[PDB]
Structure formats: C-alpha cells, structure tokens
Design a protein around this ligand. Structure first.
Ligand SMILES: *[C@@H]1O[C@H](CO)[C@@H](O[C@@H]2O[C@H](CO)[C@@H](O)[C@H](O)[C@H]2NC(C)=O)[C@H](O)[C@H]1NC(C)=O
Lengths: 227, 104, 123, 118
C-alpha cells in the first residue's frame, strides 16, 4: 500500500486545458470496496473519479484517483487532498498536494549536441543530446520531432529536473535519442521541442542534421554582384 | 559621418559611404563605399522551416536591395512554424526564436 | 529621369559646375520640369529648359533636357540639387530624383565580408 | 564513454561551458565517474551525475551521464578535462576519454568569393 499523488504537468494542462489531477496507490491489496476521496483544503469534497484501476497481473496492485479543478485555483495554490479509506488500514492516510509559491520564471536554453564522431565509428547507432538549462520552475516537458512526424517516446529518454551546481535555483534536464548512423548519415535532420511556463509562446525548439552539427567542412560559395 | 546607403537587416548587408575629405588640397577627393556582410553559414534556405538543407550560395544583387527570400533571422520581428505535438495528435504553434516572440 | 553629375575635367577649370537632369522615352509631351534645392525651387533662369524633341529610335516617344550651373566651390557642400520632374503620367504626377558628390561612383571600395556561426541574427 | 564538447551556441553566449560525459549501454549498474584534468581531480560538486537509467531500445543494459560545467573563459585555453569511468565489466575497470577545443574544429574552409559588377 503505497500511494503516488500525481499532479498534472503544466504541459499537460497547456496542451489540454483540462487540469485533471490524479493520485495512484501502488502495490496495495485490490479488494473491492476500495475507497479514496478527493477533497480541497477546506475539507469539502470535489467531483468524483471514474475508470478506477483493478488488480494488477504481478500483485503490484493499484487504484487511480481521478479529479478536476479550475486552473486558476491551482494557480492560487491551495492544498488538495485525496485520502485513502480502505479496510486494509481503515486509518485514513493523508495525501496533501499543492503548488509551491515564490518560484520565479526562467527560460530553457535548449542547445542540441550532435553525436560524437567516435560513436559514428562503431558503425551502427547514433545518439543526440537535447539539452535544457538554467530554467525555473521545475517540470519542463520535451519531445522529439522530425520530418513532420512525431517520434513515439520509446525512442527517446528524458531526464527530470535536478538543480544546477552553479545556479542556486535553476534546474536542467536532458533527452537522449538513439538512431542508426546511416539514418543520421542520410541527412535527415531532427528537431527537439520544449514546452515550459517561462517561454513566450510556451514552445521553442531547435534542430540539427549531419551538416549543422560539428561539420568538418565549411563550403561557402557566396556571390556579390554589382558593387 | 558615413551615409548608410542601405542597411538590410535580413541580409546583414550594410553599404555605407563617406567622402574622405582629403588633406586640404583642391577637390582631388575620392568618395568611398564601405561594405559589410555577415553571412551565417548556419541557417536554412527556407529561413522559416528548419527541415531544409543549410545553405551554400549567398547571392547579393546589390541592385535589388539598393531599393522576398532573405536569410537572417531579423532580431526584432520573430518567426514560428506550427508543429505537431502528441499527447493522445495535436497540431500546435511554436516559437522558433525566443526573446522576440514575447507577447508583452 | 536621371541626373548626371559634372565631368571630372569640368572640375579642373574650377568655376563652372554643370549639372544635368534629364527625361527619357515618354509620351506625351507638355511635361514640366524644374529643380529643387532643399525644398526650395531654384532660380528659373539659373537652369535652362529644353523642349520635348522626339526620340530617335522609339516609335513616337518624347524626351527633353535641362541644364544648370553653380559654383564648383559649391560642389563641396553638394546638397544633391534635387531636380523635380513633373509629368502627367506618374502615379502622383512627380518622379523626383537627385544626385550629389557622395552619390555617383567611388574609386575606393573596401568590401569587408565577415564569417561566423554566431549569426543568423542581423543585430 | 563518449565525451561531448560544449555547443557552439553556448560558447556563443560565452557564458559557461558544459561538457557532457555520456556512458552507454552497459551492465550491470553501479557505474561511477569523476572528472580529472592535469591529473588532479575536481570536487564532485563541480558536476552532477544522476545514477543509472535503463536503456529503452536495448534490454536492461544501462546508461548514465554527468555534466561538467566550466568557465568557457577557461575552456578557451586548453585544459583537456577528461572524465574517468569505473565499471566492474571493464577489462581494466577504468577507462578515460577526453576532449578539448580542438576536437570538433572543422578541418577545411571552402570559400568561393566571386565579387563582380555584372
Ligand atoms: C517555406 O517557406 C514558406 C515561406 O517562406 C512557408 O510558407 C508559409 O509559411 C507560413 C508561416 O506561418 C505558413 O503559415 C504557411 O502555411 C506556409 N505556406 C505553405 C504553402 O507552406 C513554408 O511553410 C515553408 N516551408 C514549410 C515546409 O513550412
């Protein structure tokens, strides 16, 4: 019986305007009559929760507590409470979550490093490191995008925030992508996008192909007519 | 003291001019046309679609721009290319340069 | 309309600074021209105006001329002596053009291309 | 270990250079890293590695990464800055790679200036 309280990402909101907030309990016992109630800080309950979990195949039993709120309410930053009331421990545990206050806004500085030439000599796989830096608050979101088709996340892996050594407040993150070298040798640029609530239109992005990233070759051919 | 004949902020060209009023001899002066270009060798050819090749040629028909396919991100007016995001698909905006697309 | 500057050898006698304004290949005649100097029309006698004699090779078009002199010592302040054409067949019926010392042709360039990744910006 | 040198863009800002040391596809877990330059090491505060993550594409061969961040005003000077890796599966238990500025420098320019008035 361990409960994860899952606040939606700012990204999830801003791409849905649907600020569902959930809390999951993991590896408890799936009896029936499993009961969890969402309440505000006031104690007053809120809208219910449907499509709740069932018994897991590997005994890591679960139960999703769905909820909803108005976005400004979360912006207002008041504590939210889903409490587990099941006979396993009919003692009501307290899952209280909020939004921190006082965090300033700071922007991602998305560089994008290209695969090391060495890795291009093992002759199969290539790796690209989308990077974000020096930003506040936490919880950036990223995905990778190329040729106008999205890249299903099982290609890429992303870090989570963790403070800069130098910046007292600003976090950072990563992302990693693995691709066949011939695919990267094909040209075939790649674009990593980031969405984060200090970014003007909320979304910036950068790209790289073989030619942009660390080229050995500079071929300008510039013509200047009619001086 | 120079006289900016042209200042094209989306080609980073800047043709100035300056009469080098000589040592105070008679009017044996020669006027002087400084030029300056900062070619990027980083950008696309479709400046506003980062899914194209980079660039090789940089052609300056100065006649044409002594007065629209020009290839530097001008600092002040900013760009964007609507870009799909998936959380289900969604076809959504972007901000291809920061610090200038700030609706403020 | 063009505005040719004086000749270099003109600018060695050291008195006569001729200036030429002009008009080319147009229909119809009756066009009026005058020269403007800093929003100030010149002396009408100071210049001398042609009449629209017809084109040599064009079917029926017209062209005329006008010439004006000043002190060549003045051809150091310059002020580009704007010649104001005035023809009926213009979008606003005036196609002003002007030329000064700094205009024209230099014989000392210095092109100065630079080259860098730190670009795509045009500060 | 593949070491990656800081992005030109970051050096453009010439603000602070971050070098990323990217260990790859290995087993088992419990890798370790620390940063070495001129043979004496740097405090483990000058860099940060999250502990091993699973790799998606391959089965549970792991990866990790630490990032060394330095004054570019120094990374402009040399300072080869190598990243040491410890792993039980390693035929000598300890590997290093390194990089400096002259590691992504392009070899050749190919300028073609055709100044004319035609
Ligand atoms: C190539 O560039 C052209 C113009 O430089 C782009 O054309 C339009 O760009 C605007 C930008 O907001 C879009 O809203 C339009 O939909 C574009 N029109 C078309 C027909 O694409 C063009 O988008 C660029 N190429 C790509 C692939 O986007």
């Amino acid at each position: 019986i361990r409960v994860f309280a899952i606040p939606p990402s700012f990204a999830s909101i801003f791409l849905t305007k649907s600020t569902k907030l959930t809390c999951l309990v993991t590896d408890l016992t799936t009896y029936d009559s499993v009961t969890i109630s969402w309440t505000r800080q006031n104690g007053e309950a809120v809208k219910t929760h449907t499509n709740i979990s069932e018994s897991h195949p590997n005994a890591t039993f679960s139960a999703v507590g769905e909820a909803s709120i108005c976005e400004d309410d979360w912006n207002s930053g008041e504590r939210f409470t889903c409490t587990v009331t099941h006979t396993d421990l009919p003692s009501p545990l307290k899952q209280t979550i909020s939004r921190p206050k006082g965090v300033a806004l700071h922007r991602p500085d998305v560089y994008l490093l290209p695969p090391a030439r060495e890795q291009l000599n093992l002759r199969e796989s290539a790796t690209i490191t989308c990077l974000v830096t020096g930003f506040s608050p936490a919880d950036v979101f990223v995905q990778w995008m190329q040729r106008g088709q999205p890249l299903s996340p099982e290609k890429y892996v992303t870090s989570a925030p963790m403070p800069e050594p130098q910046a007292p407040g600003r976090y950072f993150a990563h992302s990693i992508l693995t691709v066949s070298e011939e695919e990267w040798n094909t040209g075939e640029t790649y674009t990593c996008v980031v969405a984060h609530e200090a970014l003007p239109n909320r979304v910036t992005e950068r790209t790289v192909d073989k030619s942009t990233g660390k080229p050995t070759l500079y071929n300008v051919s510039l013509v200047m007519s009619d001086t | 003291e120079r006289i900016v004949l042209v200042d094209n902020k989306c080609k980073c060209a800047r043709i100035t001019s300056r009469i080098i009023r000589s040592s105070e001899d008679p009017n044996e002066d020669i006027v002087e046309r400084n030029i300056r270009i900062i070619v990027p060798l980083n950008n696309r050819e479709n400046i506003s679609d980062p899914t194209s090749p980079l660039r090789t040629r940089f052609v300056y028909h100065l006649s044409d721009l002594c007065k629209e396919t020009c290839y530097t991100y001008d600092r002040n007016k900013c760009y964007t290319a609507v870009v799909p995001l998936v959380y289900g698909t969604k076809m959504v905006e972007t901000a291809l340069t920061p610090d200038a697309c700030y609706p403020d | 309309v063009y505005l040719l500057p004086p000749a270099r050898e003109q600018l060695n006698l050291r008195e006569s600074a001729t200036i030429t304004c002009l008009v080319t290949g147009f229909s119809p005649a009756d066009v009026f021209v005058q020269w403007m100097q800093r929003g100030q029309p010149l002396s009408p006698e100071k210049y001398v105006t042609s009449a629209p004699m017809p084109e040599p090779q064009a079917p029926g078009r017209y062209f005329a001329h006008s010439i004006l002199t000043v002190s060549e010592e003045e051809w150091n302040t310059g002020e580009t002596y704007t010649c104001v054409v005035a023809h009926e067949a213009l979008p606003n019926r005036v196609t002003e053009r002007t030329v000064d010392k700094s205009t024209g042709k230099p014989t000392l360039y210095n092109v100065s291309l630079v080259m860098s990744d730190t670009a795509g910006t045009c500060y």
